[PDB]
Amino acid sequence: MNDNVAWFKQAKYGMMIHWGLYSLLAGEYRGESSSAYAEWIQSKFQIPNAEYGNLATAFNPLYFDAKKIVALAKQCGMQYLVVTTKHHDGFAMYHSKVDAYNVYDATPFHRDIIGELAEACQKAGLKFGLYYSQDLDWHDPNGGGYKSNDVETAGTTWDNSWDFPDEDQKNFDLCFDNKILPQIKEIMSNYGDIATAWFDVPMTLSEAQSQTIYDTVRELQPNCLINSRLGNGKYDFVSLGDAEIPKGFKPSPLGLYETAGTINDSWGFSYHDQNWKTPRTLYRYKQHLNDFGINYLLNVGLDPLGRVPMMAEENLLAAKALEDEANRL
Amino acid sequence: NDNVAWFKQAKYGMMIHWGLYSLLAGEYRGESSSAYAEWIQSKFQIPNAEYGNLATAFNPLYFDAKKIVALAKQCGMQYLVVTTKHHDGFAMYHSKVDAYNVYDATPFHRDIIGELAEACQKAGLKFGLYYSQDLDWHDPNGGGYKSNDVETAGTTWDNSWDFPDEDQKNFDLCFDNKILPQIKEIMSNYGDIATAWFDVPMTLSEAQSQTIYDTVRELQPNCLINSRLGNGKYDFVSLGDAEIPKFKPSPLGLYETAGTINDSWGFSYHDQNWKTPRTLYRYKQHLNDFGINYLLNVGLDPLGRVPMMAEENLLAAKALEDEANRL
Amino acid sequence: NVAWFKQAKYGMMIHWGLYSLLAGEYRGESSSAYAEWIQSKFQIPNAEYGNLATAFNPLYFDAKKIVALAKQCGMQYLVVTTKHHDGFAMYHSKVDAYNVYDATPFHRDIIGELAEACQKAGLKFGLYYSQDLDWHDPNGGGYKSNDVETAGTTWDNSWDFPDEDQKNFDLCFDNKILPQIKEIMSNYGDIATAWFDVPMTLSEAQSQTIYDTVRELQPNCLINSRLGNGKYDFVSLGDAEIGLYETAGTINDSWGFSYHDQNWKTPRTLYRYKQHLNDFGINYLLNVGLDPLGRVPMMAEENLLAAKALEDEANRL
Amino acid sequence: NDNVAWFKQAKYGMMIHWGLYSLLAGEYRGESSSAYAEWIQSKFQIPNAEYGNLATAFNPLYFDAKKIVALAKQCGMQYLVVTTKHHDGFAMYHSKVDAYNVYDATPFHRDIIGELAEACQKAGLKFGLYYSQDLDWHDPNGGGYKSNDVETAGTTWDNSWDFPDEDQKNFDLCFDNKILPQIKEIMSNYGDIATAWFDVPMTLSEAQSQTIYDTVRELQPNCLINSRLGNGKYDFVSLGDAEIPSPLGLYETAGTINDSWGFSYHDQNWKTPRTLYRYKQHLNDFGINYLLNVGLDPLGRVPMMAEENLLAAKALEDEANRL
Ligand SMILES: C[C@@H]1O[C@H](O)[C@@H](O)[C@H](O)[C@@H]1O
Ligand SMILES: C[C@@H]1O[C@H](O)[C@@H](O)[C@H](O)[C@@H]1O
Ligand SMILES: C[C@@H]1O[C@H](O)[C@@H](O)[C@H](O)[C@@H]1O
Ligand SMILES: C[C@@H]1O[C@H](O)[C@@H](O)[C@H](O)[C@@H]1O
């Protein structure tokens, strides 16, 4: 049986990690601010791939410690960790054989960060989940989003429209066949048992492309629960937006629910964003979600040195002290 | 006097700064107070006529002495120290000798010290009183007029704007007519006073310090007097931030450090620099480990409220403390 | 006023009311981003919320100094809340004693003092009025709209007045809304601009009656597009929607004063947004939320003056 | 020496703090620096082997000496003072005598002092140098080991963790082998130096202070020396905030925009444009130069808010001076 179903129902609390090249710019570019989402900075300022990709040469997070990050999650009662394997910028945070645009090949750090977090989660008894941008890829000429630019974004366009301005010649199929599916096979084959699969903004993928991803994860990771944002109705648990939380909606036939939130207002690390939700806010939101059978996936944006920001760490630990006190009395 | 043994093990107190300064909330005519919003009258040399008119707007509809004492109690605080009269010279109790007080001069028309005394008595918390015995900006002969060679959290130590003739200022007149009469009032009314919180005497003679000590002793035999009354007239030493382990003799081994949660004692809109729960708990643990009481200040807002972030950080520091003490 | 509005470029908006005294906080808990919605957010009974009037004594309120700040910043008009959703009038209303003149120790007509200050300085004067929502009125609007979330709880007062089936907005419209609109349009001289808000309950006919009333009493008053379908002179554009046009914004994230909101837009942000709007022929109406003492917050004033210094420097070079 | 007349009327300078400390950005293993993020090595007693490894991660891809000098110039600043070597003992120039420097030890592999010297020359700005002549946490005989009866923005004045034997310490060795050789390097290799910024001498003998003074005089005849080289060896007095003899009537007050000299992610306490302009006007009215510090971030950038507040202070100043 898949007892990840029963496990997910009672899991209550997860850590999400956003970490990438965007973390080095830290919500700032040439004296101007990112939107609230610092991880969208490449689109926000239309930073050419040649320049943005050169951030890889400065990626050397000397204080990255997968063990200490997992130990914080565990101390907070988090039962799983979801990490960005590849965000919208298309930079892989694992050793990708199909694309050299990755943290292993292109940075002096020269380490597989997904691998180190997979190993740390295994040793601590935490379940391990993977975030992958299956639609948007700003590094790929045929990256998705080029049909969706009638709606505003946390950057400029959904796609890379500056390096790749000819929208009528764009064919996502090529990106899907050559990068998206090959990379999904890599992350689902090389990093042990994957509990959760976190797909984002499905704007371009056909039904068939969503189905192919679903079928691939099922084959490689039989017990992996797929998030409702894969597109076109292919999933195991529903990712609820802030507006969808109890006081259209997606059916959840397994009754599995998760809301992702961040501690400040950005997913990626941002120097200027000190708007940290208080311990009381974190604990009360958690209790509310859990009471309605919804998992709280709570995001950390690691800094350029690979660190949990001091205030993210203090607020997580203080929320846990409030929770433990509330559960004793 | 088993207030001695009680004080030794008390570990944690609430301080309250509340006055007319609370209404300006760290801002005057588009400009900022210093870090100390309660010093705003001196900072901008606000004439007594104008500053005193703040009394007409003092109507804190949400002031609840019971809820304030319940917060202190939930946090493991064993006593409460409150400003009866700060440097501005505005009494926060019904003073018979001076009509410049919260009872006579405000539409609130209530004795706030009396309500806190009653609330502390019913909840079993010890009750302490802060009184500015030297500085009084409302009094023509208020102290500080000899000390203006050293900078302040305002301009001058004294009211030098309403009362500019520093030669033939005579503190004795303020001491005899306001300071000692008012100290007798707070120490006679309001029941048993556990702690007496005087401010660093800049103008007081030895004899004037002695007279205050002797008065508190007579009226409140078991009241512990803070070391800032004047040289050698005290029961416990008030240690400043700079005086804390990693100095005034304390023959009873009694020590207390006062601190605030943000950087101001009085309420300040613009000061959101709230010490984190971890900072509050760790500083408390450090002080207590050295046998020092942590007196932790709240600056009540214009409606008589504990600021939301002061209350959240106090309760979170308590949750961290309880968790640390179980494991 | 048509030609004048086209070239006006910059206005000051004022949110000021009983909500300003709670300042984004109630019994240890935060308002939403909108501190002026606090009564709905915590369902504060009218008896308690109304008692805030007894504590409304803003000793530092100075309409002359507020207009002088707007003028120094190159603002050519001022729009002020005469009555927000809570239903508390900030002028001497003859039809309702729930107003700043009758119910507060301040005992002054704040709209009157701003009207006089604007006239003497040569600034145009505009009026905000909540024609639909009124939390003080048993038949206040919004009781049909609670399928969509708000910056409080419900659109209406559903706590003092929980019987939604017995509610008839017509009664509120006839007895308070239209009488009060006649008062503000009759008693405070020439009104340049009329700022109505979310029409959720108003019939077409009720919107028409308001339009016709403002037209009669204030022939030259330009009406904002949020009165109701097709009854207006200029379009109020939201941030997402960016020949008369105006966009309203605030300096922090709240319209009413909120002491916990220190998220002040920088001078550079204020100037650049203004330049962008003006380049598209859109007026920037920029909101101040006055504090409990009637003051422009220190940081609102510093950022307004610094934005003006950046603007003047950019326009010289 | 018409640097004297020039300094009298200069009114406004940019200071730069930039080093390995900038990478930690006021945070170490989940704890905060003091208000001074540049003191982080002493604050947490970070061993030299670990702290020095920050050099391997120093790759500021957005460092642009021309854009930094252009900002200073737009703000009416007439000079730039930069940290050549702070207390940690890491040189921000290509030092021949010590390989513990930004050129030899970092992948950036560039002389940052040289690029700022060249940028200042081309823009017509005067160029000044900060050097920690007493404290050196990288040197076994670094100063401060006599001064630990007074508290610091870290722990000890000296490196007392890598070098705990205080009785075997002899500053003379550090002075002879690193301090004076390095002062000769910065005063020889980067063209005309207008200003020399030494820090309060705690360990230096009178003779060692004299030798520094005499060396700067020989190599840079027109260089004005700050009063924090020992008793009576200076050309202008560095006034503290609380102090607001000078036989040339030359005065300068240094301040920072937030509360830290080095970059600190957690310190968003930026003085407002109005505060910067009013403090400047006050200092200038008393004949005091305002030296205003920027702490560059790990990518070599002026923090967004430091740049916005500098430009807005200038707009307020220009407006005030027209009306
Ligand atoms: C968790 C969030 O999902 C969104 O759709 C993304 O666009 C954001 O970057 C973020 O990762
Ligand atoms: C507790 C504090 O003691 C200081 O010395 C006073 O000057 C402050 O205003 C405050 O009362
Ligand atoms: C200007 C804004 O318009 C909205 O409709 C209101 O609900 C807000 O409180 C504010 O007054
Ligand atoms: C300019 C400042 O004053 C001194 O030099 C140092 O102690 C500080 O870190 C900083 O360099």
Residue numbers in the entry:
A (entry chain A): 1 to 247, 264 to 345
B (entry chain E): 2 to 247, 265 to 345
C (entry chain G): 4 to 245, 271 to 345
D (entry chain C): 2 to 245, 267 to 345
The authors write:
Lactobacillus casei produces a GH29A α-fucosidase, AlfC, that is ~104-fold more active on α(1-6)-fucosyl linkages compared to other linkages. This enzyme is particularly relevant because α(1-6) linkages form the basis of human core fucosylation, which significantly impacts the function of glycoproteins such as antibodies. AlfC is a single-domain enzyme that adopts a (β/α)8 fold typical of GH29 enzymes, with an active site at the center of the barrel. Our results suggest that AlfC employs a conserved hydrolytic mechanism with a specific subsite that accommodates GlcNAc in α(1,6)-linkages, while AlfC tranfucosidase mutants work by shifting equilibrium between open and closed conformations of an active-site loop.
In contrast, N243A showed very high activity (~90% yield with respect to the acceptor GlcNAc), equal to or exceeding the yield of E274A. E39A produced very low yields (~5%), while N243A again equaled the yields (~80%) provided by E274A. We solved the X-ray crystal structures of both of these enzymes. They exhibited no major conformational changes compared to AlfCWT, with CαRMSD < 0.25 Å for each of the enzymes. AlfCN243A was nearly identical to wild-type, including at the site of mutation. This is not surprising, as N243 does not form contacts with any other residues in the AlfC crystal structures. The differences in dynamics for AlfCN243A were more subtle, with this enzyme displaying increases in deuteration in some regions, and decreases in others, both less pronounced than in AlfCE274A. However, like in AlfCE274A, the region containing D242 showed increases in deuteration, suggesting that this enzyme might also sample more open conformations. There was also a large (103-fold) decrease in turnover for N243A, implicating a role for this residue in catalysis. Furthermore, in our studies of AlfCN243A presented here, we showed that the fucose that gets added can be hydrolyzed by AlfCWT following treatment with EndoS2.
